[PDB]
Amino acid sequence: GSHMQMYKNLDLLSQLNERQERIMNEAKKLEKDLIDWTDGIAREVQDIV
């Protein structure tokens, strides 16, 4: 009845939380790639200069 409807809706959090964890993972990835890019370019430019 009303309670099961309520529980099914509360349970949609599962999918939303999956998405939140994906986006957080992609932000961490991006941060690490930006750092590694910057460090890698600096080493290369130092090699040139």
Numbering used by the authors: 1 to 49
Quote the paper.
In this process, small GTPase Rab5 functions as a master regulator of the early endosomal biogenesis. Rabex-5 is a specific GEF for Rab5, Rab17, and Rab21. Rabaptin-5 is a key effector of Rab5 and plays an important role in both homotypic and heterotypic fusions of early endosomes. The GEF activity of Rabex-5 is autoinhibited by its CC domain and is activated by the binding of Rabaptin-5 via its C2-1 domain.
In the Rabex-5CC structure, Rabex-5CC also forms a long α-helix (about 65 Å) and the four Rabex-5CC in the asymmetric unit form a tight four-helix bundle via the nonpolar surface. The nonpolar surface of Rabex-5CC has good chemical and geometrical complementarities with the nonpolar surface groove of the GEF domain and thus might be able to bind there to block the substrate binding and hence autoinhibit the GEF activity as proposed by Delprato and Lambright (2007). Nonetheless, our structural and biochemical data show that although Rabex-5CC alone exists as a stable helix in both solution and crystal structure, it cannot form a stable complex with the GEF domain as shown by both GST pull-down assay and ITC analysis (data not shown).
